[PDB]
Paper text:
Escherichia coli YtfE is a di-iron protein of the widespread Repair of Iron Centers proteins (RIC) family that has the capacity to donate iron, which is a crucial component of the biogenesis of the ubiquitous family of iron-sulfur proteins. Bacterial RICs are composed by an N-terminal ScdA-like domain and a C-terminal domain that folds as a four-helix bundle where a histidine/carboxylate di-iron type center is inserted. In E. coli YtfE, the best studied RIC protein, the center is coordinated by H84, H129, H160, H204, and two μ-carboxylate bridges formed by E133 and E208. We show that YtfE establishes protein-protein interactions with the scaffold IscU, where the transient cluster is formed, and the cysteine desulfurase IscS.
The mutation of E125 (which is located at ca. 9 Å from its nearest iron in the di-iron center) to leucine generated a protein with an intact binuclear site. Escherichia coli YtfEM and YtfEM-E125L contain a di-iron site coordinated by four histidine residues, through their Nε2 atoms (H84 and H204 for Fe1, H129 and H160 for Fe2), and two bidentate glutamic acids that bridge the two irons (E133, E208). The mutation in YtfEM-E125L induced a major modification of the channel. In this case, a significant shortening of the distance between the sidechains of residues L125 and E159 is observed, from 8.5 Å in YtfEM to 5.3 Å in YtfEM-E125L. As a consequence, the new position of L125 results in the occlusion of the channel and, consequently, the di-iron center is no longer exposed to the solvent. The closing of the channel is consistent with the different iron release properties of the YtfEM-E125L, and explains why this mutant protein is no longer able to promote the formation of the Fe-S center in IscS. In particular, the ferric dissociation constant of YtfE is substantially modified by the E125L mutation, becoming about 4-fold larger than that determined for the wild-type protein. Mutation of E125 to asparagine decreased the V0 values by about 3-fold whereas a leucine substitution reduced the iron-release rate by ca. 8-fold. On the contrary, the spectra of the reaction mixtures containing IscU and YtfE-E125N or IscU and YtfE-E125L exhibited very weak bands, which indicates that the amount of ISC formed in IscU is negligible. However, and unexpectedly, the YtfE-E125L mutant has a hindered capacity to release iron and is not able to promote the assembly of the iron-sulfur center in IscU. These results were rationalized by the analysis of the crystal structure of YtfEM-E125L showing that the positioning of the L125 sidechain blocks the external part of the hydrophilic channel, and consequently impairs the release of iron from the di-iron cluster to protein exterior.
Residue numbers in the entry: 2 to 220
């Protein structure tokens, strides 16, 4: 019956379900309202297998369940756990990609364009996180979340843009899989990319699937 539940709710209730969905390239973050059934069908996946994997994960509860946590605590968590980390992650990745694209320019597997797309993502996240921290999050903390349809819709649109950039970054890097000739810096950079993707999806998931709907509902 997991297939009839939304991707977002599964990711938020089952430990490491997020990483399972990442493995299947299912967008539980911006597309978290869609059922696992619909997502698995769009990708021609055996949904029974996925339900078995989720059942194994669900043997234990999620260590921290944010679905019912105070919105102020969710906001403060987002800022430290995700916003502050993205601010450090992206500059480092941009410099690594520049070095990789230069040093391995001749090699056929080099992820040409990676720096460009990381820079685009960094520019988007920088302004985006500033708008949330300076406009939307204070509004929610003040209790005006029920009036935030406009601002939230803008943020969710920017989340979609970030999702599109993540898709290009994954394609450019053969789904963040380095070639055999990959140097240490190359492999380390891909590990950092996967960490960024993991974090940004959980980050967007927490906003799209918990903070924003609960704020709009007046919680
Ligand atoms: Fe955010
Ligand atoms: Fe956001």
């Amino acid at each position: 019956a997991y297939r009839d539940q939304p991707l977002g709710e599964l990711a938020l209730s089952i430990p490491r379900a997020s990483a399972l969905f990442r493995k299947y390239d299912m967008d539980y973050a911006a597309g978290g309202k869609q059922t696992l059934a619909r997502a698995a069908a769009r990708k021609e996946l055996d949904v029974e297998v996925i339900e078995a994997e989720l059942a194994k994960l669900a043997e234990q509860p999620i260590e921290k369940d944010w679905r019912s946590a105070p919105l102020a605590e969710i906001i403060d968590h987002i800022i430290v756990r995700y916003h502050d980390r993205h601010r450090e992650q992206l500059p480092e990745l941009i410099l690594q990609a520049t070095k990789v694209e230069r040093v391995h320019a001749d090699k056929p597997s080099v992820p040409k364009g990676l720096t460009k797309y990381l820079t685009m993502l960094h520019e988007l996240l920088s302004s985006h996180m500033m708008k949330e921290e300076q406009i939307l999050f204070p509004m929610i903390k003040q209790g005006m979340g029920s009036q935030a349809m406009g601002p939230i819709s803008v943020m969710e649109s920017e989340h979609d843009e970030a999702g599109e950039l993540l898709e290009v970054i994954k394609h450019t890097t053969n789904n963040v899989t380095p070639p055999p000739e990959a140097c240490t810096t190359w492999k380390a950079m891909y590990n950092g990319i996967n960490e960024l993707i993991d974090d940004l999806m959980d980050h967007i998931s927490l906003e799209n699937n918990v903070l924003f709907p609960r704020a709009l509902a007046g919680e």
